[PDB]
């Protein structure tokens, strides 16, 4: 059993007040069931979509979750992921420099 | 050249949570172009890239029928696997398959592939000769014996030499201006203090296609391949990719550090430095 | 195009 | 909406057991059940099941068409939308019907077979059910003719998934979820595409009582078991294959009639090779 790697990042370089896409890429996990939410100030964003399930050469799965969003100074974004390999949900904050 | 086509199947049982499920996705190089999901109300093979959308109804109808049959076959394979491994019918299990072909600049076959896994470990694979199998364990050896008795490798070899190459060639043409046009990375270096003695230098590559790329840090010309933090290459969501490479440097020594970027979209390799 | 070859375990 | 399921089978004998599970919001607890005619009237006076509902021993009162709703506290209504429907069919309530295959139970890969259910009891419906599958039985209306009711189930193109042990059941008017005792079972086996074996007799096919004759099934293919069938309709004999010095795989059945042999593999009893050429003993 393999626990997910998680990256949170925007499709384009962030600029406050400019329409963009927020991404949470989960990868390297097995088995395939996984729960991923994008959070805005601790709160689940509703209209989130994901890519079709696929996997890497080592058989581990990956998915991209994404939503359209307009970033601001005050709003803090994160990605929350749960999986069988995890006792508690892992949470990764969006840092514009990562 | 060179290019590849791959199909990836995931077949999963999940007693009490849902019906067994079969999902298939198709890729040309790093670009997904079709998907099929048995959970859909009316499952069909469906386009996931614009250049396949104008393919005719006979294509979609044929692929849909093929996927429905493959879904049935793999649901049954999950049952069979339970017997092979003496596992209970209460547990959840997964079969994964990836197969396809690599071609050269000339559109000719370079190599064929067909590999299967059970619960995330190698189960059985078609050998490079495309005429024999490597089975990973005794269960898989049962599967191997069936496939030899049924001459499966011959049929698969016929697929890999024929349809796989012919269709990959067609798709590469249909999508030429996206599939065969490398996008160079837009690059930059950022600097982030850690203490009042150390700092992080991060070399960024964004918006590139295909996914293949090399980012290295050098300190007066010696690769820091041992002292480099390298993030996994990630999708931007628009059929381009992103990556970065970071290295921790002592304060005031930033200038002996260089980031080297290699990608097919670049005329010449890039050498960047922070200022 | 996907493979028409049946793979029964 | 929740996912409702019956375990181990929705087709279940009186006196047996079946458990309904209602999976919702990644758990199996806190749900209510409903049957098809009373849809907004929860059964058992609105019993809120704290875990999977085990019905055991099964009675005819358990037969029916169920949906569940899961608890959903922080939402407009207290509860979820209705789940997929699961029909519990209880068997053992009428005399068993008969099941036969046309033209026979050994079915060539890619071909079709008819499984006919029939009875001198007037069954309004017939149900065909493969052993061990969670596939819902196939249902057909019975057709009345000359003092029998009967139905023809078409099966195929034949593949492994269609192969296995089948039984058929009837139901009578006004108790559609109550099934008869099962018919005697029929093993429907798919043959091919695995290469046909060779059949031979030692010392030969010419025998006079009372001297010994052994029939040998052989192949270059690594079959794990061989099946010897005599057109005279005695249930096939089975024996393990043994690897020989010249690398063939062979079984020797020590014993007239016309015979054929088939190979098969470990853990795989409903798929056999193409048949050998016939041999007359
Ligand atoms: C075999 C049978 O009666 N199935 C019924 C179905 O036709 C109906 O749609 C459903 C409503 O929940 O209840 C179930
Ligand atoms: C309604 C009905 O009995 N249909 C057919 C019958 O004509 C046939 O003799 C039998 C065997 O093929 O299968 C059934
Ligand atoms: C094709 C061939 O060589 N077959 C022979 C077979 O006739 C014999 O029964 C067996 C055991 O002695 O060895 C092998």
GROMACS .gro file of N, CA and C in nm, chain B residues 100-104 106-113 128 130 157 159-162 164-165 168-169:
model
   72
  198UNK      N    1   0.075  -0.097  -2.562
  198UNK     CA    2   0.086  -0.004  -2.672
  198UNK      C    3   0.215  -0.013  -2.748
  199UNK      N    4   0.241   0.088  -2.829
  199UNK     CA    5   0.354   0.081  -2.921
  199UNK      C    6   0.436   0.208  -2.921
  200UNK      N    7   0.567   0.195  -2.946
  200UNK     CA    8   0.656   0.309  -2.968
  200UNK      C    9   0.698   0.303  -3.114
  201UNK      N   10   0.700   0.420  -3.179
  201UNK     CA   11   0.742   0.433  -3.318
  201UNK      C   12   0.853   0.538  -3.331
  202UNK      N   13   0.936   0.525  -3.435
  202UNK     CA   14   1.041   0.620  -3.464
  202UNK      C   15   0.995   0.736  -3.551
  204UNK      N   16   1.022   0.790  -3.848
  204UNK     CA   17   0.968   0.736  -3.973
  204UNK      C   18   0.833   0.666  -3.960
  205UNK      N   19   0.776   0.668  -3.840
  205UNK     CA   20   0.646   0.607  -3.820
  205UNK      C   21   0.651   0.456  -3.806
  206UNK      N   22   0.771   0.401  -3.809
  206UNK     CA   23   0.785   0.257  -3.798
  206UNK      C   24   0.797   0.208  -3.654
  207UNK      N   25   0.746   0.088  -3.628
  207UNK     CA   26   0.750   0.030  -3.493
  207UNK      C   27   0.891   0.018  -3.437
  208UNK      N   28   0.909   0.067  -3.315
  208UNK     CA   29   1.034   0.050  -3.243
  208UNK      C   30   1.016  -0.057  -3.137
  209UNK      N   31   0.905  -0.049  -3.064
  209UNK     CA   32   0.884  -0.149  -2.959
  209UNK      C   33   0.738  -0.167  -2.918
  210UNK      N   34   0.696  -0.289  -2.883
  210UNK     CA   35   0.560  -0.311  -2.835
  210UNK      C   36   0.557  -0.347  -2.688
  211UNK      N   37   0.445  -0.321  -2.620
  211UNK     CA   38   0.435  -0.340  -2.475
  211UNK      C   39   0.300  -0.399  -2.440
  226UNK      N   40   0.980  -0.857  -2.489
  226UNK     CA   41   1.023  -0.772  -2.600
  226UNK      C   42   1.007  -0.838  -2.738
  228UNK      N   43   0.771  -1.004  -2.829
  228UNK     CA   44   0.626  -1.008  -2.857
  228UNK      C   45   0.577  -1.149  -2.892
  255UNK      N   46   0.070  -0.954  -3.099
  255UNK     CA   47   0.180  -0.914  -3.186
  255UNK      C   48   0.123  -0.855  -3.316
  257UNK      N   49  -0.167  -0.711  -3.349
  257UNK     CA   50  -0.217  -0.577  -3.313
  257UNK      C   51  -0.105  -0.473  -3.305
  258UNK      N   52   0.004  -0.509  -3.238
  258UNK     CA   53   0.112  -0.414  -3.212
  258UNK      C   54   0.187  -0.373  -3.339
  259UNK      N   55   0.200  -0.467  -3.433
  259UNK     CA   56   0.266  -0.441  -3.561
  259UNK      C   57   0.179  -0.366  -3.662
  260UNK      N   58   0.047  -0.382  -3.649
  260UNK     CA   59  -0.050  -0.334  -3.746
  260UNK      C   60  -0.129  -0.212  -3.700
  262UNK      N   61  -0.192  -0.075  -3.411
  262UNK     CA   62  -0.138   0.017  -3.312
  262UNK      C   63  -0.053   0.126  -3.380
  263UNK      N   64   0.038   0.082  -3.468
  263UNK     CA   65   0.127   0.174  -3.541
  263UNK      C   66   0.051   0.263  -3.640
  266UNK      N   67  -0.162   0.515  -3.444
  266UNK     CA   68  -0.074   0.615  -3.382
  266UNK      C   69  -0.030   0.715  -3.488
  267UNK      N   70   0.006   0.665  -3.606
  267UNK     CA   71   0.046   0.752  -3.715
  267UNK      C   72  -0.069   0.849  -3.752
   0.00000   0.00000   0.00000
